[PDB]
Amino acid sequence: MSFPPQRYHYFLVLDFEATCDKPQIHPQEIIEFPILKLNGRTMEIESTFHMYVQPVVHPQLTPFCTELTGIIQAMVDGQPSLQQVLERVDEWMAKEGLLDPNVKSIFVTCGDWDLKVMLPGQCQYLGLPVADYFKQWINLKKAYSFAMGCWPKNGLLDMNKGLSLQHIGRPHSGIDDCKNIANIMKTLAYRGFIFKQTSK
Ligand SMILES: Nc1ncnc2c1ncn2[C@@H]1O[C@H](COP(=O)(O)O)[C@@H](O)[C@H]1O
Ligand SMILES: [Mn+2]
Numbered sequence: 334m335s336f337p338p339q340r341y342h343y344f345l346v347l348d349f350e351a352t353c354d355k356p357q358i359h360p361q362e363i364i365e366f367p368i369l370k371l372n373g374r375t376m377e378i379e380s381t382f383h384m385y386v387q388p389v390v391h392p393q394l395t396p397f398c399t400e401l402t403g404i405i406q407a408m409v410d411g412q413p414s415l416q417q418v419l420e421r422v423d424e425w426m427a428k429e430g431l432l433d434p435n436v437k438s439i440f441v442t443c444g445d446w447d448l449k450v451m452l453p454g455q456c457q458y459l460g461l462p463v464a465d466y467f468k469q470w471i472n473l474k475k476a477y478s479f480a481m482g483c484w485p486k487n488g489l490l491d492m493n494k495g496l497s498l499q500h501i502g503r504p505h506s507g508i509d510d511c512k513n514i515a516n517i518m519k520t521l522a523y524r525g526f527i528f529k530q531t532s533k
């Protein structure tokens with residue numbers, strides 16, 4: 334059945350961008366924090382949280398980081414740090430109605446890195462508690478492997494290839510990576526896939 338009933342009222346698509354360098358910078362710090370709120374049944378985008386984040390440990394973006402993500406220095410200067418952005422997220426969750434125990438939602442990321450490595454690692458570095466809704470998610474690569482029966486090699490690019498979808502926007506932009514995740518989800522639901530939590 335196309336677009337079957339799903340287990341969640343809403344899906345929260347997330348894809349961080351972080352400071353980086355060649356070889357990798359340490360520690361990494363989140364510099365882009367997007368969330369797309371998807372209708373649980375249709376996968377349509379109904380609301381968007383999007384904030385750039387000011388890094389503190391390594392405050393100046395490297396040339397590699399700007400080339401990779403497209404994020405320039407003026408986009409993070411004057412921004413709130415991660416602690417404040419997380420409070421903005423909580424307020425946004427509240428306004429969207431996602432803090433109701435009877436409203437079911439879950440984050441969806443491309444891989445496990447965002448919520449298994451990046452966010453809890455930086456919160457630990459900062460002595461910040463991770464909000465409980467960040468502790469369960471769906472790895473799209475894993476969901477795709479169940480839906481299509483195959484393991485994609487390179488994330489969004491290869492999942493778009495397998496589904497004959499055109500890439501949306503700019504690769505390695507957090508918000509655009511989110512739009513592609515949402516578009517892949519829409520197709521998987523069209524093909525009859527019911528999404529399930531994959532985090533452990
Ligand atoms: N090829 C790469 N080399 C170094 N760092 C990367 C690379 N790709 C991604 N990253 C880092 O991982 C973050 C998330 O990328 P992505 O998982 O592609 O959305 C980026 O913002 C960078 O900090
Ligand atoms: Mn990513």
Ligand SMILES: [Mn+2]
Pocket residue numbers: 348349350505506507510
């Ligand atoms: Mn990305």
